[PDB]
Amino acid sequence: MIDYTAAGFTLLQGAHLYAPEDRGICDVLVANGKIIAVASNIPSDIVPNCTVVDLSGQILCPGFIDQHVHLIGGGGQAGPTTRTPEVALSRLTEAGVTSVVGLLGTDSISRHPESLLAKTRALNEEGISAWMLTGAYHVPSRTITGSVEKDVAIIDRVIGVKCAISDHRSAAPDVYHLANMAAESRVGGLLGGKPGVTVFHMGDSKKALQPIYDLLENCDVPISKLLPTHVNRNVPLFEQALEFARKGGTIDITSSIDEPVAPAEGIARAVQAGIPLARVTLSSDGNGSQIGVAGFETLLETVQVLVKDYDFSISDALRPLTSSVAGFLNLTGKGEILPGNDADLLVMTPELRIEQVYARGKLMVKDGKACVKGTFET
Amino acid sequence: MIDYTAAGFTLLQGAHLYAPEDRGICDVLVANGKIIAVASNIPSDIVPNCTVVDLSGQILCPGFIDQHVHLIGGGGQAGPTTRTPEVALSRLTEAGVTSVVGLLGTDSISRHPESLLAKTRALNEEGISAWMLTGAYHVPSRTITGSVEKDVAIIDRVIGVKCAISDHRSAAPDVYHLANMAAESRVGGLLGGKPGVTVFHMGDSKKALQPIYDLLENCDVPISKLLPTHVNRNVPLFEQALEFARKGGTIDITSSIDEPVAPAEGIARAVQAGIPLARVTLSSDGNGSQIGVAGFETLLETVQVLVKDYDFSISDALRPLTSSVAGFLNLTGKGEILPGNDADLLVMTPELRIEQVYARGKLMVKDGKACVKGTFET
Amino acid sequence: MIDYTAAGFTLLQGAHLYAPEDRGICDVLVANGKIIAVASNIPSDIVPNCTVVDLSGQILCPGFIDQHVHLIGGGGQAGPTTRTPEVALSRLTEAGVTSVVGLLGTDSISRHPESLLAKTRALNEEGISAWMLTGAYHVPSRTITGSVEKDVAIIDRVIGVKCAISDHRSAAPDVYHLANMAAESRVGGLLGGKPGVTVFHMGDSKKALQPIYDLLENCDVPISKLLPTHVNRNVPLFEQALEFARKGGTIDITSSIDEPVAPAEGIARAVQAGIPLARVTLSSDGNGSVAGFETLLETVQVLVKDYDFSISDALRPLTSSVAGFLNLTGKGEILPGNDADLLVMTPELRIEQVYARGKLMVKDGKACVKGTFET
Amino acid sequence: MIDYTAAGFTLLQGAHLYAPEDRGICDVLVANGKIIAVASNIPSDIVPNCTVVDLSGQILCPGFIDQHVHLIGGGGQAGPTTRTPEVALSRLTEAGVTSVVGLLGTDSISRHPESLLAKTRALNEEGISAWMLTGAYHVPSRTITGSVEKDVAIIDRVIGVKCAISDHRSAAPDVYHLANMAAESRVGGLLGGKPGVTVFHMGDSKKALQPIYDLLENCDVPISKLLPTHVNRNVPLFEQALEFARKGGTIDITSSIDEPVAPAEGIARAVQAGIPLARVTLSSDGNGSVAGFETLLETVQVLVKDYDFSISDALRPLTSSVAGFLNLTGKGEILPGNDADLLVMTPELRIEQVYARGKLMVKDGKACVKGTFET
């Protein structure tokens, strides 16, 4: 008897697959955490020591990518008792999240990029995929190596930089400071093989997107590296974001913001405005302070709403959380079900309720409950 | 015989109380430095080991909050012989001051925030309540931790930052530098649970308030965090301050400046202009250089004048020194006589002359003379 | 009706009081979070709007002071996944802890004093009392302001410095670096009105206390400012510890270390060795890697149960001895003028109620007050 | 037809397998760059789209791990013209090297860790596996982030630190500086999940290993984290090295140093001295001043040919021993779950094929995969 168990062969059979593209009833063969074949009717005996999974009647889609999470905790805006706690593995996984991008916010005094970096690594070690942004609301940026360009270029998990504009919690940055920082992130990413993006937390100032336009007039950073987030927070801002997207920018809608522009509503309007889904993403702002802390249920909720109350197809509904995110951040191997991609998959009921979650080919959630937990989860 | 002396029970009986709100003849019961009951006719035997004080015929009001004092000394503008000496406890208390905010001025070369911080702490230890501002006239700010945001966030006694504008003694700051500094103070205060204000020493430049308006156009710091002081120093400046107050800003009048706009006059005009007292404060600039050094008698003097020559009610007269200050700096437990507030009280004759002063429930002045002195007072 | 509720009058009646000193059946009156009277038979009507609590048949004693807690989390010695989570309020209060001193350990790369300082502040706001030590195992120390001397003098919650010696995770400090760091903490303590102590995490190196002795010969910091902790981790170290205590030093036994010298055992031997309880402390090392806080109370139970200690004495290492060593004014003793940090226990020493600064935190053995984000 | 080519199924059949352990004639199945099965007679049809390679009559073994390579170039000791060029991929793979650890030497003015780090990354992308050491001969170390402890904990490819002792090109380090630096690497290793080793370039000074012994008496870093290299450079040093190994240390023999103690000879004497192979490593010092990589394989040949070693044993110093010392998970042994880093040799030990992470890199003794700018 030959042992082939090292391969971790798993055959996912008979689900209706949304890659997110509708592929109909189709099988998925996994090995070594990778998707190795996608096809209708894969012989259950094509490989030895194969775990076969009957998904008949279920749906199979790619795992969500949540690009805005306060992995080590956030808050602190109303004193020290408001510092939220760190994110626990199970919370992410039960929410359908297989890939995450961690970041800092208002507080960069009691929160440090080194802490964030360690947490990012723990999460990868625990089973999912994680990256981070250097900086925080504060401009000039607080970094690990002393320079934004150096952080993006040399710290493996760093993919870009974060900042805040048009917000009463900003560092009142001027255009030069902003331009320089985005330029450093851009360059650092070429060198490091990273997207080199600049993510802008938007507040409620009436100036809205101005600073971004100013910046573009003062530098050569491509518009495709600039990401405004929390765009649904106020109407006028939302409206400008639409045009920003119309000009070739990508906009990030926050799932945790219900009013004045609800998330599904925001996505629907984009489409109405003729904006291609590829230029719209959805992120949670999870673990930030809400006093409660923002969770991850809003992601799934948005997909359900879009399908059920908005007439989106499941395929379209999935984009903002999968392919558009991977697309924007250049996350190779993620967001789509293709041979050669990582085996980050969700298994859902036809009513869009998660039953199982695979991260890198490993069963993380079964029967809608986490079977793999963070090291200190109790 | 049971000892209940630890409580320090004190009953202040029968004065006409101005909370500053007129409460008429009313009693005040104190314990553990706190006001525990305010009411007419409190039974002199409600608590054991109670010190009863007959205030019949007298007035009872809250202790003054002087938010602009050069606690460690100031001056130095005309050479080293002009460096004034540090403030002595008794000077404050005999002047009716129970709470103070220390700060630096022109000289930040021979004066350091660490010195100011130590002095602040000594004063609390000696019996009164004290806080400070980081920075000084110089922009960029000279701080303790290296950053304005960090100083406000982590040094317990630091509540904001000071600077100078439109003055021949300024560091010729540009809008960005100013904006950044105010933004840091603002943010630092959210984190630290401080007001996070920015206090602007105003000089006689013709530009007057401009820089403040410029700043607001270049940042998202709320107008309510910005405090221009010495507004009565020149007419045109005073006039602009009125409108500044009209737009929602708070203005600080300096009691030690007699011309061209006297303090009581300044306060009267504000009211004439329809500005709510809540938006007007009065501070001494005590211990700065005047060669003499500015004292604290001008505070009380202003209240007397307002009542006697201006027709203000005592209640109204008290605001700028009590509730409006506490209101502006968010000094919980101060500026008002309510159960649960600190027992910082003044006892005056009907002609507004101070007889006794209680700081945190402790008798500091009796018969208009200090009975508790600074450790080195001789 | 006049309202006097701002005073928070509370009368704890009928318990057998251990201050820690046995005081027999005695009453305790509280106002504004402070103990205002201690006597038998205080009248229930002595003050208006008084909450009377009948504790007859129960024991009353001071809240515990745990001077060795990884408040923001610790661990990380076996990689990133081993970083423990921050401590929740209820875990402390349920274990009888009303005062705590937070610190860092091995990891001072992903762990920062500024973070520790915020957490310290959070806890104070939440209802208990907390302080911290600056530095970490690493020497030179990583501080907030850039100087150990400055951190201790100016940061209100900082009371001393932490370091590691004789351990395979130390920074290989030399005597000069150790002396200087201890002297800075000492001096900062004076300027800031802090104890200005130096806390030494002890490892298993054969050199044991050597470095301390060396330090003493190289500086003039008083012996009473130097605290070796984890002294019960190995025999030779423990024995050396006894000697150090005999010379005038204080020693900290770790409740979470059960072998080779158990906590109660170590305490009993110290005493049997002629060392006064005043020079013996007990701390948990709670939240390190996740070590909990139940061993504290258990040590007390064991001392009484198996070692012939009176209750009074068994309490000292967690109350008066710590408060005394750290100069925690208002803590560790039930006296008029002190803070109302009290435990209510059954005669068999099970925690029933806990008051911190006069506020009821735990009732029927269960936290009734929780951390802001406690789930 | 269903496409399964994404898996890269490859079946290596019929070779005499040395894992390094002699396993006789046995098959190896590979998928996704990992070894998924090791057994005799694996069915050629067991998996779809399988590339079958008939290796009958050949030997199969693990790829070599060269832990001492001047990846970006070295030299510069006789002025600017002596700076050697960076290492090309094919030079490594042709020599049987599939895993490498890069480092700096004498020159840390014209040579930077950031440059070394980029080159390390380049190689990983090009198909092999690479790590680096922070620092250089200079002590205090010149690092990327400013701290040895921080470099090791946070820079993914950094696994330890390099330094020079007992050499006329050293920085004249004192024991404190050496101890501190070793302790920082040790601690960073723990936090980052790295071996956290200290690699000591040994020169010809008569003091030989002294500094190491001294260091040990001045810190608590385990002996197993300290690696003296170039130990065969002189006799007295070599002999002292044997002793150090006997005490529990590991020793690195330089394949490029032929006198006075040749590489094979040194290995044979170590063994004859009672030292287990697990505590003996072999590295090239390749690309220094331009030293090549052929002496690696030659040492193996000589051990077998002239020293009575079995093949299994002769392989250890370049495979399992290194992987074990550096904790290189997935490397140095042919086991299910490990990376497909394999060599195909003739029975007389000549390299024929080389696979790195399952990719064919060298064929018929010639690189068939080259560096991006390889000419």
Ligand SMILES: [Zn+2]
């Ligand atoms: Zn945000």
Ligand SMILES: [Zn+2]
């Ligand atoms: Zn956020």
Ligand SMILES: [Zn+2]
């Ligand atoms: Zn001024």
Ligand SMILES: [Zn+2]
């Ligand atoms: Zn002034």
Ligand SMILES: [Zn+2]
């Ligand atoms: Zn320890």
Ligand SMILES: [Zn+2]
């Ligand atoms: Zn500890």
Ligand SMILES: [Zn+2]
């Ligand atoms: Zn060398």
Ligand SMILES: [Zn+2]
């Ligand atoms: Zn070398």
